[model samples]
Target: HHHMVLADLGRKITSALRSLSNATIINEEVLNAMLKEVCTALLEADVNIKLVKQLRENVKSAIDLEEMASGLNKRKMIQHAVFKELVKLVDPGVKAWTPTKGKQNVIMFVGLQGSGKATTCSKLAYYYQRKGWKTCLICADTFRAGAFDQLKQNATKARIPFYGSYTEMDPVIIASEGVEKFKNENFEIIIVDTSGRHKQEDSLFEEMLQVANAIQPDNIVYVMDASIGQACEAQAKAFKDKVDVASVIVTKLDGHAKGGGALSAVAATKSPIIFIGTGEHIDDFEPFKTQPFISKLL
Candidate 1:
């Protein structure tokens, strides 16, 4: 949905730097424009405004004002200084949750809007399945029947077992039945799919509560957009602690996003960002690591 600005927010800093190198010379004019675009891109990508300011402030001192005026050796400083700074931005120092190998680790995906929750469900299950963990899927999105079909495609393609109602709109029953069916079948990781209904309407939270109660979610992974920007903290806080989510994944992390907001937002939940959707492909998913997270943002 966020087909908007700064040419690819995630790698824009690097991309912006590359653009400077492509020019006649790495002069002050280019340096000025580069920094402007860097800050511009981050701000637009839903990063906390002050955080980006910190980046600007930190980068300025690290590079030294006198040296940057000549724009000499400014290249390495931008790359070196900026990268070190972002590493701090990405790692919120939260502990991540891991699934139990032999136990029925019921992980539920909860969030509204098309944050690619269904695809993430399969990707995560696929991850566990590759690890030799018996993983399955359960589509509890009664708010939209289409999600069942989408989940079906992902589940089938990945060769994972899944359950969802055909005509029933109630998610509670579907969740209960699906959980019981797989729980006894020795499934190690059962990934549940919830409705992506927009807005924090009463019915939304009510449905989450009911379905969660039915399956007893072992882990709730709230999938959110990297583009949510300023609203990232509040929204993340609501779905996380309020719903008792133990994990969070930043969906739609198309490397070009400023990703500043994404990192901070993940911290807002005080929950770890376990994984991120990097691109269009299924395996485009990547685990959230301090160095690697900033590396992609490199």
Candidate 2:
């Protein structure tokens, strides 16, 4: 679907343009108009204001460069460079799934309710499982009704082991017990799914802190919804108060989200993005790649 839209849009733009061989340096009027279009598109997509402004300046600087002045087809040249820069800003295509050489890799998933934390566990399980690693899920979200079952069902789909208790076990207890169970079973990876929180509540943070201390996870991942834009940074910071997030997994990017605001969170948390959930398909998960991802923005 996206490929068709891009192809059709490209054809229309190319057809309306004059011959590139005769093209000259981009005029001030054309540069302003193109920059306006780019800014408007990013703003409509809920990108952060600071990022949008910075991107505009970048485009302006690129157009003013002497290299662009000597280029034929100034408009095409500017567009190509601009797109490349934009893609650089939004570049997040790195995968964060890696197993320990001989020890158990304990990955704890933390995020707000409905941010797709549960579903992300399943996706990540499938990610490592396909790599020939024995993965298991520890459902420590006993506070939320049916949260355990949700993870259990997802584990079934990923063909991974699941350990959960309906006996109202503390999250710390569950995590500790799950670690022992995985060790005995010789599982290479164990994903602990804790209860979701808004990340704004102090009580919730306290509970999450206990869970982290007990498990001492090899990787602490904060799952932020890509659609939330700038709010993602605040959420990431809030979670940082409890446990250090090693990486971020931005999900729900299937919408009109340009995913620029996620950079704020990444910068704040100082954690590289490990993976991104692009679509509804289970295989749509991919690792972060900086250069090509930014190239698309152009």
Candidate 3:
């Protein structure tokens, strides 16, 4: 049920695209019908209106309905155009930050509160742990009273080593200390979960920069909640401007229509989505490859 909800978008897109199979000639009539259905499906899936509008035109530009006609590979060409443009919709056209095994890589996680930053920190560490990399979690989220404990229980459950402080209130000190401690021990993957403002106070970004300066993270990952729809772009941009956001991880996509909008935020953030959180469980995490994601529909 969790995954099926996401696949609903794919089903419509695939079905809408496949409808053209009935046409022997890929004319304007057939092409317009397909675009209408495709865009409609995207809109219902809570895709950003402007992007949907852009997509409508881009595919049309790529396909050129006037040029398509009765020919063997004509329909195939149109399908590929749809596929390519779909990829371009979210593709940042940049390489994502890669973590190396057998070496220390400091990764910082950031997001506003309730964006599932803590949960995703655990998920990422568990991901590395499952991949046989030496991974540990550092809970620098001293902002919320339960944030540290939330991370602690998850790390304990996943059996990944972790570092956090009960009394140390300064996030930068904890971040620098924990990262240094783990690097000294030669942990391969050190993930630092930073504070998400309980409210969007300027002090939140201030603390983030403080921690960023302390650790000099190899990568700064912005955790995003997909339910926010079009607002995702601005939130991601704000974070990107404040810090050089190397990548993004979107959460709460299991049953959300605006998940498409969240996916669309990759273009706005100008960073690639390295992974996605399908649900709250650690195992629900999945590596995001655009080709596989789109290919499943075909």
Name the candidate that leads on lDDT. 3
Q: Please report how far candidate 2 places residue 298 from its true position, in Å.
A: 6.0
Candidate RMSDs in Å, in order, are 5.2, 4.2, 2.2
Count backbone clashes in candidate 1: 8
lDDT of 2 by residue, 1-298 (tens): 2242123222322332333223455467656666666666556555677777887787677665445434366666666656665554464333444567667889988777668888888888889889888888888886677888887777778778899887866778988999889978888888898888544557656666788888788888888777776667677666655564457788876654445556544544455687878777778787666564543322
- Give per-residue CA lDDT, model 1, range 1-298, as digits (tens): 1242223665567777678667776656776787788888777777777777887788777766454566356677666777787776666667788887767888877776767776878888888777899889999886564888888888888898988877887778888888899999988898888888756645556777788887888888878777665566776666666665467787765554445676666674576778877677778777877785566555
Question: Which number leads on TM-score?
Answer: 3
Off by over 4 Å in 1: 1-41, 44-46, 56-81, 201-203, 255-258
TM-scores, each model vs. reference = 0.76, 0.80, 0.92
Ranking the candidates on TM-score from highest down gives: 3, 2, 1
lDDT of each: 0.74, 0.68, 0.81
Model 2 spans > 4 angstroms off: 1-25, 63-77, 91-99, 197-201, 240-242, 256-270, 294-298
> In model 1, which residue pairs have backbone atoms overlapping below 3 Å?
8-256, 9-256, 9-257, 9-258, 10-256, 10-257, 46-229, 47-261
| lDDT-superior candidate, 1 or 3 | 3
